[PDB]
Amino acid sequence: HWGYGKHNGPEHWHKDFPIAKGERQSPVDIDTHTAKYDPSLKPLSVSYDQATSLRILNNGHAFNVEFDDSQDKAVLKGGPLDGTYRLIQFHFHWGSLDGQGSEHTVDKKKYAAELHLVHWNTKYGDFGKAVQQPDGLAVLGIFLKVGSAKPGLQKVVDVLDSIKTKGKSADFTNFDPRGLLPESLDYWTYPGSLTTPPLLECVTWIVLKEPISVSSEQVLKFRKLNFNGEGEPEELMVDNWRPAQPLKNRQIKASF
Ligand SMILES: [O][B+]1([O])O[C]C2=C1[C]=C([N]C(=S)[N]C1=[C][C]=[C][C]=[C]1)[C]=[C]2
């Protein structure tokens, strides 16, 4: 099936998922000089204090840390959002080299990786229903730049040996996602899509201006993961990012 190889990568996805050539595809390049400051945009409201992480898993495309979303424990509200969006999971996209890895770019600059905190609009009842709606998901995107280590990220890095291959999972309770946020919540926002098949156009993207810093060792360990399943030929999980797509008829708004 789909992947990030030369034979099944982003340039091939449109054959099975024609929406790949849609009107509101992600990611996109964020041109800082063209983004429109919108004084009407409200501050984001990230309430993760009651977050309940459950487990971490390697699904062959990235590693996902899942949360209990059967109640309004960890939610995202405010900003450009109407309503309450519940955190269901987070994952990253990264590169084979420090100079690439993020999906969104800023004035064409690529970061070493990009964290996606995925949330779904509770008015739709469940995640499956939400992805069929234009305002079904709110993904908070955060860039990672290589520099000093991110203490909060280390708990995730240390458990990766236990989910090296596709289909492996491990218990991952009591993880606090607040440890993954930068100091500032200034952001850019635009309507887009999942950056992976089915590439549904159901996402309100909220991308933070301020990157978090992670050490070269932390991202290096991301690169030791495998796309393949155990017992299959080893393919390192790197460059699991889709390149910037045409902005088309959309405006990127800035909260600052
Ligand atoms: O492209 B992404 O990596 O970036 C942001 C993001 C990504 C993937 C998903 N999708 C998830 S969690 N499940 C899913 C599975 C099947 C159909 C629809 C959705 C959600 C958010």
Ligand SMILES: [Zn+2]
């Ligand atoms: Zn993602």
